[PDB]
Amino acid sequence: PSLSKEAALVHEALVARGLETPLRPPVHEMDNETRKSLIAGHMTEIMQLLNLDLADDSLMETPHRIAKMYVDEIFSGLDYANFPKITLIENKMKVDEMVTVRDITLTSTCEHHFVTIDGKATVAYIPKDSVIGLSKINRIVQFFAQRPQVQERLTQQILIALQTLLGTNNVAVSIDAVHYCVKARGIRDATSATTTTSLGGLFKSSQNTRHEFLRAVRHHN
């Protein structure tokens, strides 16, 4: 009772290429309710250095909400215990052209200011011996997304994970997103978006394949 075959495989692959999120061993076995109260403790401190009145009916519970959100939600992707269960049917249909999943909702956080990243992901792969459940791609994407991230690392992690679970390197990933740490503060650019793409296999090597995919990416609604 710890990890799953797939979860293990992916994690190994990610460290092997040295693409895992920069983590440290958990040292000693610390409860999650402990981590959460500890984290609310610090949030109470920060909130006081801001001069907010924690006595307020609305503010009082924020430290604890921020604590559950960090551990249970927006960063749950740092604990492989949360990896999604994977299901794969055999490729009896003999699909040999690419399958594409466009405009996958994707919300993450910039590791640089812990601010929101709103974006869309398009993922395509060429089935080999197995066909993956379609929702699973959405879930694998949201998983890596729930981690403090840098867009370039995010795009690459997804490629590797899917590559690992599908059994081919013929996978491609493109992400188009908006960083609120560029929009809401700093340079305050309200109109820019960033686009990153990772291409494995034929998607990288074969010019014709490379463009059918790039030609398909970017489907604004």
- 149, 157, 163, 179: the active-site residue: 179
Least gap, CB of 62 to Zn ion (angstroms): 9
Considering beta carbons, is residue 181 or 216 the nearer one to Cl ion? 181
- Side-chain half-sphere of 91: how many Cα atoms within 13 Å? 15
**106, amino acid identity:** L
What is the Cα–Cα distance from 211 to 95, expressed in whole angstroms? 19
**Residue 45 bears catalytic tag:** no
Considering beta carbons, is residue 69 or 78 the nearer one to Cl ion? 69
What is the Cα–Cα distance from 4 to 91, expressed in whole angstroms? 23
What is the Cα–Cα distance from 154 to 150, expressed in whole angstroms? 6
What is the Cα–Cα distance from 154 to 220, expressed in whole angstroms? 21
**Strand 116-125 relative to strand 148-149, pairing:** unpaired
Indicate which of Zn ion, Cl ion, a copy of itself, none lies near residue 82 (CB less than 5 to 8 Å, by partner kind).
Answer: none
Considering beta carbons, is residue 37 or 135 the nearer one to Cl ion? 135
Indicate which of Cl ion, a copy of itself, Zn ion, none lies near residue 168 (CB less than 5 to 8 Å, by partner kind).
Answer: none
Under rule CB under 5 A, residue 167 binds Cl ion: no
Question: Residues forming the annotated binding site for Zn(2+)?
Answer: 110, 113, 181
Give the burial string for 114-143 (b: 16+ CB within 10 Å, else e): eebbebbbbbbbbbeeebbeeebbbebbbb
On whether the CB atoms of residues 159 and 126 are closer than 8 A, the answer is no
Helix 151-166 × helix 5-16 angle, to 10°? 130
Indicate which of Cl ion, Zn ion, a copy of itself, none lies near residue 13 (CB less than 5 to 8 Å, by partner kind).
Answer: none
- 151, 156, 157, 163: the active-site residue: 151
Helix (H, G, I), strand (E, B) or coil at 7: helix
Least gap, CB of 199 to Zn ion (angstroms): 25
Indicate which of a copy of itself, Zn ion, Cl ion, none lies near residue 209 (CB less than 5 to 8 Å, by partner kind).
Answer: none
Least gap, CB of 163 to a copy of itself (angstroms): 14
On whether the CB atoms of residues 148 and 75 are closer than 8 A, the answer is yes
Least gap, CB of 1 to a copy of itself (angstroms): 20
**Residue 110 bears catalytic tag:** yes
Under rule CB under 5 A, residue 185 binds Cl ion: no
Tell me how many residues contact Cl ion (CB under 5 A): 2
**Residue 11 bears catalytic tag:** no
Note the residues at the interface with Cl ion (CB under 5 A).
135, 186
Catalytic residues: 110-113, 151, 179, 181
